[PDB]
Amino acid sequence: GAMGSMERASLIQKAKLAEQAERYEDMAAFMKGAVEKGEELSCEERNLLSVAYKNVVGGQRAAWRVLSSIEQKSNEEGSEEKGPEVREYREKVETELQGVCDTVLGLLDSHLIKEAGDAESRVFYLKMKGDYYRYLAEVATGDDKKRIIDSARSAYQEAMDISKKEMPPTNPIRLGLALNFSVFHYEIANSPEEAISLAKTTFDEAMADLHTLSEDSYKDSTLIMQLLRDNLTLWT
């Protein structure tokens, strides 16, 4: 749409400016423009895309949880009836959140996943697909809830099978997928045991593979193993 007249290299350049300015909504729109040029994204470009949307939907999720919490409070025994406003404003944020998740998923589906033949790009896009369905599951409430949770699990699982076949245990994408799938098990799929087992074996297999690594072109991997450990500490 709006980015159709801008050069692909000018979109990538502006997305990096928007990142430095913490302007994530502009960053997401530049990267959506760039995707819509129809060429594959490089490793660096993939990172720009995922960071931009993670941040946009991250602020929506934080706002949704403040509002949903207010809303649940107003439904407790002896809470004063405040009218329709809290539900209305919660639904507004929620529908804006859902439209951003639908936009990311439409980008994955047209045509990032289908054209992704290397493991690192394929796994990366399937992880994103799992995360965005997960964000949708967090707010899902009606009939769709089961199906959304399953689209998340199904995307994460396909990314896991490929990452296990094609990537070393310390690969940062392989590690971040396991971190996130493991959170899915805990917070969405009601499977705290599967969550804990996945983070543990993930952490342990990556430990045993550190010796093969240069010291350090693997700061992202170090950071993620730490988040696996922090999750394990919260959960056990």
Binding site: D131, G176, L179, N180, V183, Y186, E187, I224, L227, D230, N231, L234, W235
Partner: peptide
């Protein structure tokens, strides 16, 4: 809230 990446 647990960490994700």
């Amino acid at each position: 809230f647990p960490a994700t990446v």
